[model samples]
Target: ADQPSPTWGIDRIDQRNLPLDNNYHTDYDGSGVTAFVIDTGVLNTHNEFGGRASSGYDFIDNDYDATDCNGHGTHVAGTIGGSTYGVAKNVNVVGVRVLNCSGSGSNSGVIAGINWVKNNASGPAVANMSLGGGASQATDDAVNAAVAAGITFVVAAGNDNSNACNYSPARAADAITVGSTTSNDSRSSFSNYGTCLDIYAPGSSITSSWYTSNSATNTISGTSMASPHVAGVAALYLDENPNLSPAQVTNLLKTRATADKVTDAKTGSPNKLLFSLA
Candidate 1:
């Protein structure tokens, strides 16, 4: 197989917050929170991930090694709860591979993955999900169960750049719906919008880990980038306030996110990200 040369970690719109050092690095490292990563798959063998794979499944092809093919899953995973740049780096990740190389999976796969997480939860855990799709009854029910189980569900709003509300888990009333904001405190070019979007984070041409043989990789653009920023932060909160419940973790991030640039002026008439608030 003639593989293209691998690129190292890329810089994200969050570069404004660079040196890229998150408060969570100094705070939690996501140790206590049992985080679940539901995506197309993960590169579990990647050295950056520390080869620390456990408690996961493959709902797509029904294989256990949720490894990465398109790198989206790995990128999203890095943001939410990775140990390197991830706020909850130390947080235990339950890898659930739901998508495939095309980044597309059936609604049934997602539903099944959600159920697996619910059924396999060792305790009250925080979930980091960067995938989405049209609405489904199974997802609604699964989200409800997660909430009832006292899990904090975090999701990406979507990169559709439309006034339409984000679908599935993002639409789930209880899950934390996160949108993307640029370092300039504006919405990213591809970020989905609507009242359904709860908050935003640095989403522009965002940078983070991929399958770099070295440190981090350079890839940008997506609501997925933004979601993990919040997830990492959520994990940090749990790291700092170990006694805090999932609700408390959710509250701090939601209430604490400040304002940023105004990218989506037309769709973003009134509501805007509070990136600077924190």
Candidate 2:
């Protein structure tokens, strides 16, 4: 049977022909994992989120209801954890609004979000970050700290068409830095590239969970959208492989990734990408 495509949604890579087990449904919808998204505010009211968007903190204002002032975070959250419009709808989302409505955040705020995740992350938890600016040692240190605490960190390479080393947080080690690719697996013209980047995912004209200001859905772009595709897949990995810790899952994500399929922007070198059980 052909799955119906939503009028205002992106294509979810065919899940029926997935390379994994056919009976794996409900075996890995990230049913028991929590993912923290550090970006612009999220649309906490989306039904795809399963009404469980209260596990995160807002470093930008130190308040609750980190609303979708920017909408990028909401979009990213939907991609990783929204079922109706996302890849992994059964996963739990932890909204950590660090960047403002402009999609930009001070290094201090980003640092604060990283620290918060380090102290948190009880049970099966992951951090899905889809924004970055210039590189910084301080930010790397913060991300490293979170990685050390057994918290998996997923980030985005800058969308400036430059090499990834030019981006912050993406340059941070131990964090899964994702690049962007079109639906056909070609690199995004705006996505940063380099050996420093870890993987690539669907990013072009992505139609996933979005907000409605007046009854119409909002469409978006950037590595921010790409990061969640992998993050949501990570949630599936966590659900299927419950025994894997954050570090172990990180390794599995890398080791099990499909390789030499996508080209890099720096050396134009080819690299492999990964997929989950489902």
Candidate 3:
């Protein structure tokens, strides 16, 4: 059988020995898993989604139209489940729009988005929070409650070149905090680090879907771009083991990870680079 080869970020995944190649080879394309993308909404009509994207909510407008007027969420969604550029090719994406067209949101909006995911999500699910700001107790509690309810929350460590502990969801005890790595396996210059950071993924100059048009594509760099890779891989794990709890999934991911000493000193090296096998 012929396998599809993605032109951009897939190479980085292969270079890092990520689970995405294993998922493709084993035909575990996140078939029954759903990932809620909590960001600037997604362009649900993008072809990369394969019609698997649906509106979750828009806290900015308080409406059902979860479209990406800001473009960030659409890129995140593509990395998570785009038909060609995705890690979990067949996964369903639910857009939870917390950020508005300016790519910013308040703690209240983010909490509302998390609450929406808690109330929705019909099956085994993962939630990706690629946006972050200052730490907030309310945001942390929302993530804790979501984890208690069984949703795996994957979050960005932030791009501030400082400790991730200063951020909200990234610093949350239960969230899987992700940092960025360049193609050469070095930590991204801007990615935040600290004990709170849980994993590293390809993030620098990575390419994925865009909202400019249906067939549009673009490249971006940040921990915001790194979080969804873990989220997508988490979806793949759920597809294979639907009964796995959020804690189980987190442990499995770390157990399956490969050590990348390049980021060792910065993040205590406790968190391995994301990886997998069939």
The global C-alpha lDDT for each of the candidates, from Candidate 1 onward, is 0.65, 0.72, 0.85
Number of the top-ranking candidate, with TM-score as the measure:
3
Q: How would you encode candidate 2's per-residue C-alpha lDDT over 177-258 as one tens digit per residue?
A: 8888765566888988887788777676776656554122456778887788778777878877767766787777777666
User: TM-score of the candidate numbered 2?
Assistant: 0.87
Cα lDDT tens digits, model 1, 1-278, are 11122111222312334343332213246666677788867666655566444538888778777667767777777766555545455666667888878888888888888888888777547777788888765787897787677777788887777752538777787777777766555677777777777677767766556754436465687777777776666666766666766677666765665434455634543353423122
Q: For residue 247, give model 3's deviation from the true position in Å.
A: 0.2
Q: Per-prediction RMSD in angstroms? A: 5.8, 3.7, 2.5
Model 3 pairs in collision: none
lDDT of 3: 0.85
| Candidate whose lDDT is highest | 3
Q: Judging by TM-score, tell me the better candidate of 1 and 2.
A: 2
Off by over 4 Å in 2: 1-27, 213-216, 263-270
lDDT of 3 by residue, 1-278 (tens): 12455644444553444334422333477889999999999999999997999999999999999999989999999999987778888899999999989998888989999999988877899999998888898999999999999999999999998999998988999999999987667788998988898888878887899999999998999998889988988988999899999999999988877665345328453557776343
TM-score-wise, the better of 1 and 3 is 3
What's the best-to-worst order under TM-score? 3, 2, 1
User: TM-score, each model?
Assistant: 0.82, 0.87, 0.93
After superposition of all CA atoms, the RMSD between model 2 and the true structure is: 3.7
